[PDB]
Structure formats: structure tokens, C-alpha cells
Design a protein around this ligand. Sequence first.
Ligand SMILES: Cc1cc2nc3c(=O)[nH]c(=O)nc-3n(C[C@H](O)[C@H](O)[C@H](O)COP(=O)(O)OP(=O)(O)OC[C@H]3O[C@@H](n4cnc5c(N)ncnc54)[C@H](O)[C@@H]3O)c2cc1C
Ligand SMILES: Cc1cc2nc3c(=O)[nH]c(=O)nc-3n(C[C@H](O)[C@H](O)[C@H](O)COP(=O)(O)OP(=O)(O)OC[C@H]3O[C@@H](n4cnc5c(N)ncnc54)[C@H](O)[C@@H]3O)c2cc1C
Lengths: 126, 126
Amino acid sequence: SMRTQQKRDTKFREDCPPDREELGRHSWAVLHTLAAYYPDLPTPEQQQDMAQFIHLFSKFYPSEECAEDLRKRLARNHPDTRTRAAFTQWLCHLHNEVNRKLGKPDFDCSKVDERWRDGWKDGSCD
Amino acid sequence: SMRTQQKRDTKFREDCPPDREELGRHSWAVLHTLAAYYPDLPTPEQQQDMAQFIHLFSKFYPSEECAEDLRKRLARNHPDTRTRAAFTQWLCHLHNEVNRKLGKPDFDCSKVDERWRDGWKDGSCD
Ligand SMILES: Cc1cc2nc3c(=O)[nH]c(=O)nc-3n(C[C@H](O)[C@H](O)[C@H](O)COP(=O)(O)OP(=O)(O)OC[C@H]3O[C@@H](n4cnc5c(N)ncnc54)[C@H](O)[C@@H]3O)c2cc1C
Ligand SMILES: Cc1cc2nc3c(=O)[nH]c(=O)nc-3n(C[C@H](O)[C@H](O)[C@H](O)COP(=O)(O)OP(=O)(O)OC[C@H]3O[C@@H](n4cnc5c(N)ncnc54)[C@H](O)[C@@H]3O)c2cc1C
């Protein structure tokens, strides 16, 4: 007809405030990348500090419906910050809870190191 | 000649681990958007919590040269979390310190609400 709700075909200026979905994509990128490089043997102070960082993220996330849903999840499913393996997996399953809520498919958590740190073992990121 | 160092012309798969520059763009988007929606009259607990969030961000940022430079800055220039106006401006000047370090121009901090929350007053984001 002529307007379209397909955003890529409408709004061409990139230096605009993120919307809910764009803030979501930036935020998952930040969280999964921080997790990907977290220590395999973090000190107790680091484990405490990462748990507090996730908690404080949930207080300040500015999409209020998303933030409320996050604070509820963290109440039933505290972050496992014991190791890089535990924390990267924990955050992957959390992200999948949100994907399922929104009708998006599960991401295969076995792929988290390829996706967020190492690149696909086929070399398609190189 | 035939390879190019212009990344947009080389690597076409978007679901790859962010590099230093891509993690930077996601991270500034997250920080400036969190700041944009912070309260104008935050409680003392919120002011404390936002300062700790920035500190913990600086401990966990996984590009180590960037993170070290950040922790140095925060030692000389503590976050002003007293109000939304103070904090959005504080974070803009911090981002400009990094821009200057890297040979990028200053961003006009008077534009921060347009850029990160409201959209340009000319309506080019609508
Ligand atoms: C903490 C948080 C809570 C949110 N809650 C809500 C909400 O309650 N309601 C709402 O409408 N929106 C919410 N969002 C926004 C939402 O999750 C999506 O970010 C947004 O809808 C964009 O979806 P997307 O399809 O682009 O992919 P996103 O879900 O943004 O995913 C980005 C990329 O991450 C990778 N990925 C996907 N799943 C995983 C996984 N499980 N582990 C590792 N990598 C993965 C994929 O490569 C994907 O393209 C929230 C976002 C955040 C960061
Ligand atoms: C905390 C932090 C520290 C970093 N330290 C380093 C480092 O020491 N060395 C290094 O090589 N890289 C560092 N980076 C990465 C670096 O700042 C850039 O993110 C990266 O080089 C990409 O640059 P860019 O030109 O795409 O724009 P970015 O600087 O990523 O900016 C993204 C967008 O933010 C907007 N913007 C720019 N400046 C401001 C401002 N002052 N206030 C509000 N909005 C603004 C503009 O619209 C811009 O396009 C760091 C990033 C972070 C988040």
C-alpha cells in the first residue's frame, strides 16, 4: 500500500534513540560478551561482584516491563557466577526464558562460546 | 587490489562475536540509554547503586586496555549520579575523553537527550 511497519524500510537515520528491541539486542551483546570473558576460576570477590552487577543491571534496565520481568526471574533463578562455564550457560538459559516468553526459538546453549567469543568452528566469522 | 580492511565489505555474517569496536558501540548504547532514563530525583540508594554499577562495569569490561583506561578515569573523575541531568552529562563528557584519546571528534553534549531518549527535534527519527 505504501507505509510499512518493516523498520529497516522506513527509518534510515542510525543515530537515533534505541527502541525496546534495539536496546535488547545491544544489551544481550554486552551481557553475553562480558560473560564470555569472565574468569574460569574467579575469586570470591569477582563472583560476588558479578552477581551484584546483574542485580544492579536489573534495577536500572529502562524498559520497565522487561526490567520487572527480569527482577522476577532473578528472584527464582539467582545468577550462577561460580565459573565462566556456569555463568555463560546460566545467562544463555536466562536469555532462552525470554525468547520462549516472546515466541522466539531456543538458542542452542552449546553454541555460546562460538557465538560470543571464539567464532563458529567453520570459520564463517573470519 | 582485492582483500579489503573495510569490515562491512568482508564479513557478512552478523551473528559473530563482537570485536573491540562493535562491543564499544553496543556498550555506549547501553550506558547512554540507561542514563537517559535514570530518575531526575533518584533516591540516595539509587545514586549509590548507579555509582556501583559503573564501577562494576569497569571491573568486568572485557577489552582489557579499554577497561584499564576506564578504571583510571573513574579514579580521577567519579561518576556524578546525583540526577539524570548530571549523570547523562557526566557520561557524555566521559565518552568524549575516550573520543579525544582515539582521534574522534567531541560529541556535543547538549544533544544527549535528543540522541539517546527523545529523538532529534527535527523529527528525523520518526
Ligand atoms: C535482560 C533482558 C530482558 C528482556 N525482557 C524483555 C521482555 O520481558 N519483553 C520484551 O518484549 N523484550 C524483552 N527484552 C528485549 C528482547 O529479549 C529482545 O532483545 C528483542 O525482542 C530483540 O529480539 P531479537 O530477535 O533481535 O534477538 P535477541 O533476543 O535480542 O538476541 C540477540 C542475539 O543473541 C543471540 N541469542 C539469542 N538467544 C541466545 C541465548 N539464549 N544465549 C546466547 N545468545 C543468544 C542470537 O544470536 C540473537 O540474534 C529483554 C532484553 C533484555 C536484555
Ligand atoms: C567505557 C568504554 C571505554 C572504551 N575505551 C576504549 C579505549 O581505551 N580504546 C579503544 O580503542 N576503544 C575503547 N572503547 C571502544 C570505543 O570508545 C568506541 O566504542 C569504538 O572505537 C567504536 O567507535 P565508534 O566511532 O563506532 O563510536 P562510539 O564511540 O562507539 O560511539 C557510538 C555512538 O555514540 C554517540 N556518541 C559519541 N560520543 C558521544 C558522547 N560523548 N556522548 C553521547 N553519545 C556519544 C555517537 O552517536 C556515536 O556514533 C571503549 C568503549 C567503552 C564503552
